[PDB]
Symmetry: D2
Subunit: 393 residues, 4 copies
């Protein structure tokens, strides 16, 4: 009856123009899936479906999920499809898996997400049928398909300044939150707390192989004083900066989704039980609020109250989004993004939801905490949340 997550694994997260800049999103997912199969010893024929989140599908080739599955070493008989709920896509893949299992379409699904923002191409809308006369634009696909609202064409960061204004989120509070994310992430990383969830990727370049084993996007030297000096990135009188938002990152995460009975039968070690799912939508312009209704839905399904939850893992799309969700729900600061968030480690859009589920799977194992919520705000005005309970042993 219970649907469980087993063997959650992720790549380290690459910086913009960083170690993963030449490695397609689909190749990162294939690497995690191959490693997952090697470590679990799961019979590849027991995989009924591969579901992968991917937002910037432009130029990635036919059906990213099918490339992840086949290049990950699964038999050609394993079906696969790609899901896009923007920032929530990596968590959506796990919700899709849950729905397939609960509806009887699948017994075991490999679910996750992939993204590489460097690898997003430029688009030429006028090249097919011609520009005819006069200058024409080449669009950055990461803005057109990933970060700009589809209704306004304004950046997500520009819209988030209206969330800042509505909830009176001070520059000082955003920079305090951002510095704390960096400090928490650096301490956890140094303590080895992310080694269990990370699978190394070997990158071959010119006359070199480089073993990419550790998240590279974080800035342990970040201070409130340093952050206060940065210029607003999206509006002249704004509060959001390069320092209180994540970068343009690359990575992949994947996990096994099955009934508890299926996991036990196949000698898997379940990490989390899915106790509740929430998917909600709000005004595109206030998309940072999306986690609030989504979390309420997930908690209602789990029959939990906010104060019953050991940790909330809410995507740091902006420091401002973290603060609005934490403060609106009255979550204790010590229980909110406990080991740091995307401001430190990065936001590889379509993978981030799978990365946060992976983080919580390993954090509950280490701490013996019982109850967690993963939630992400979603460009276009949506929210996704999963209520998750540790499985013992």
């Amino acid at each position: 009856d219970e649907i469980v997550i087993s063997s959650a694994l992720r790549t380290p997260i690459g910086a913009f123009s960083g170690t993963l800049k030449d490695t397609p999103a689909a190749a990162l997912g294939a690497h995690v899936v191959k490693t997952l199969l090697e470590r679990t010893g799961l019979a590849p024929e027991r995989v009924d479906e591969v579901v992968m989140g991917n937002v910037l599908q432009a130029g990635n080739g036919m059906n990213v999920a099918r490339q992840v599955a086949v290049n990950g070493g699964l038999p050609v008989a394993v079906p696969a499809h790609t899901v896009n709920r923007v920032c929530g896509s990596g968590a959506q893949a796990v919700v899709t898996a849950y729905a397939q299992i609960r509806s009887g379409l699948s017994n075991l699904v490999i679910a996750g997400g992939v993204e590489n923002m460097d690898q997003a191409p430029y688009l030429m809308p006028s090249l097919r049928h011609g520009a005819r006369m006069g200058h024409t634009q080449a669009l950055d696909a990461l803005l057109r398909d990933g970060l700009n609202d589809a209704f306004s064409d304004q950046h997500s960061g520009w819209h988030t300044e209206d969330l800042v204004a509505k909830y009176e989120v001070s520059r000082e509070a955003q920079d305090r939150f951002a510095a704390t994310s960096q400090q928490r992430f650096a301490a956890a990383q140094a303590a080895g707390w992310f080694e269990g969830e990370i699978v190394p990727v070997t990158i071959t370049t010119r006359k070199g192989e480089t073993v990419f084993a550790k998240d590279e996007a974080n800035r342990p030297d970040t201070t409130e004083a340093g952050l206060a000096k940065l210029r607003p990135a999206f509006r002249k009188d704004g509060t959001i900066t390069a320092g209180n938002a994540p970068g343009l990152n690359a990575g992949a995460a994947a996990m096994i989704v099955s009934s508890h009975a299926t996991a036990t039968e196949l000698g898997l070690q379940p990490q989390l039980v899915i106790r509740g799912i929430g998917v909600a939508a709000v005004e595109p312009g206030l998309f940072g609020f999306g986690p609030v209704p989504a979390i309420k839905l997930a908690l209602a399904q789990a029959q939990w109250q906010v104060q019953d939850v050991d940790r909330f893992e809410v995507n740091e799309a902006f420091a401002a989004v973290g603060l609005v969700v934490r403060d609106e729900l009255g979550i204790a600061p010590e229980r909110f993004n406990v080991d740091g968030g995307a401001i430190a480690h990065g936001h590889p859009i379509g993978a981030t939801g799978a990365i946060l589920l992976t983080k919580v799977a390993h954090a509950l194992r280490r701490t013996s905490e019982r109850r967690a919520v993963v939630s992400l705000c979603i460009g276009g005005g949506q929210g996704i949340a999963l209520a998750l309970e540790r499985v013992k042993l």
Copy 2:
């Protein structure tokens, strides 16, 4: 289990390559169908729990096509939406996704469909972000890179389908006979008014005014076996597949309501089909045209139907060769296979086609009083999707 049903299946007419819809984004086509569906049904917009849309060529369509379809279709901003991609099967996948959400208790009512506009697919410049440095560089047609070329070989779907032709010994003449028959069946059904009920007109604004696009335009009623025999192979020098025994590069949208039978009745909807069986299968990428065979067998097994129980099979004409291989492998009577013609005539707007075929069957069973149908599509990359569908008695 309560029965999961399809209600109010509707589609745009299908545009030709460089045709009437060439300047109308896929998301705008879906928005138009959703708006019309809400207007005609009077469905309370707050009772829509999710919009799921198939779309294969997402490049340049903007953030989350399904959310654009939902919001521009007039649904409240409180309705969530996501986009699915199982290539050619995406429009049928959206309905399977809806089924799974309802059966799992995540949703009570979903608007599901698909959208595609192949003219609107942009060119891609992989080297523009970090530079070409020195030497010529390529601009990729996204239609090929993300839609029609296999991701493993980079060869066209049509090139791979010549290996299906060789394996099953499908003659050029058999493919051209099938293609001519698809055009003749489609033209006769169209002229008889059999597609009027499923089609919603789209008003297109241009420099020189408005065009009311009300009728499929990609079909060639004058097609003959003799005319098709004149054409050159499109994909291999010694090949059999031509521009005439394959569909075009088309544009369109289709959408429908998916819910329990009880939910449909409660909200004053008129269910058209019950989903009796779902099959999703995968095969060698190189032999993807065979995908419907295992998918149909899975869907029939779930419905507890045999091939001979099915009044009509609606199998996507990705190529005439795929239609022939699937029909003959399953032993389906030619008179019961793509009865009113298929994609060779009306077109293959990739991510919408699965939703278009479900829509076609919903209206055809209502007209004929046929009881049982199977919709199936082969899928680039080596997959197959099938739904076993039963008419609801109204």
Copy 3:
């Protein structure tokens, strides 16, 4: 030691997106040169140099003039170079030829110009080293390298509205001049007056040929009433429209330049003597005035005055430029662009100067007029003029 023009020939002029849209400028020039050699029977080894004007060189390949020469059938031993004085380039090629002959560097030069504005590519300045993040521009080379001023980045038509304001050139006068250009051109064309100067080009398509034999860009049905309805193209409350300016055209012209003695020695039939050359420069913003100082310089060299000249052939860059030059010099309206101009036939930038020299060579032969001036205004603020006399 008179320098003469012989065997001036041109292609018909193609419309924007018209019959020549798939035929490179260099191929148009090659075709004229091949035809010129076939008709004259000139020994190819007697050609010392090929000089070709071409403004939009982007994407045309290494040295357009050398492609015209070699693809035109001349021996590989014939040197060639490409000149760019924007709108004046096709006339500049003939001035370059004159200078080479008078200085003893050459005895016989094939000089002309080529342009195909459809064939001008788009430019991607950010593709070499990357756009990194954010949308980036692809430039239309015909604007960047051909029609926009290099200092202001404003269109030539936008700058010409300041010439209109300075000289108080009414919209009605511009439209009357434009209608008259169309009417004069259509009547002359119908009378066969352009047959002698035009060489047909065969264009190969699908499984088909098109023989392109006649200018296609003109609008014989043009009226003042029709032109009055058009919207300003360059400024909101402007006077310049699509109807009182030329299009974005394609074509080529070429001719033999030599001493009179060399022409006679080689059995050529000289058409014109170059009696005077003027090259002048003005404010980029008032480039339409450029022909005035250039014409005065050319007339001074020829020891002619305006009233001595049977016809002026001044490029119709805009109707406004034609009117300003005509009225500043006091030229009789019936002696100014007598058989119509670029508003009707088109302005294939780098070829136009060679096309106007070609037109005048054939018009003086037909009319027995003695004296002509060819002049063009030049984007960036220049003018070129040649004073020309009919050879018997």
Copy 4:
């Protein structure tokens, strides 16, 4: 009347992706012209014309020569035009000037050339009227308009392998020539022999200012042993490498051309008399041979024999071209590219001819040598040569 060159000056030559990568060719020419006017005190009204060579005109804006003239500070009443005889363009500008003066069209011309190969754009031939369906090419303009033959579409370096084969030019001879070019250039540079001809350019960058005062493309540490290790650049079994050919360089040069009488009247100090001009053409495929007929034409006009010439300055388009021209004409190695050539300093195509005239003007002043020949081979199968005599005082 003698036609003379006065006040020949050049920028230092930039490396590919080097100091001048963001400075348009037209701006480099403007800087030389402005400096030339400032130093000579020449009355700007006495300039009858500016003629500039430029090969890669794509994207440089309307009429590069007019931009050089106007941005160089000359009155708008000075006419200007741009010439293109590919690699010979910078020398062609001086021949054009000579012809204008001798024919009476001009009394005084500022002639030179400009090029910036980094600044050459990519071209999209199919963007105006559309690619319709299928992949399409974006062309590197430096290949399409500058370095690939217009008839074969093969690189100039690929064609030069046929010159190598015809004249049996060994790899070892090419590498010896290239090493010697580097050694000669480095010694001459260190001796201060290029200070007189070079005008510094101040480059304003994001982070501040660079005073670019010295040629940067040369490799003084070059050895025959090092060059022997390099892979062929153009054919698998080839001899031409990155080390025995010049780079993709940027720079400008300009000079005053006038009668001797005009120069003296205006207080200029003539450096060279033009005693002979040769322009020749050959098979496009053997364009490296072009200097041979061109030099014979220039020497015939000057009534000189090869052995009467104190130094030959023949553009090092490839080491192979230098060797073929030197050995075909029987020129003493000690009198051929005496202070090094383009393999060391670079080949900024449309400027190189003006750079070589400038180099010879200053070298004859220093050495009191009487007679020089400047010659360049030209893509498409041409050659240009000038026979030049030192003017005293």
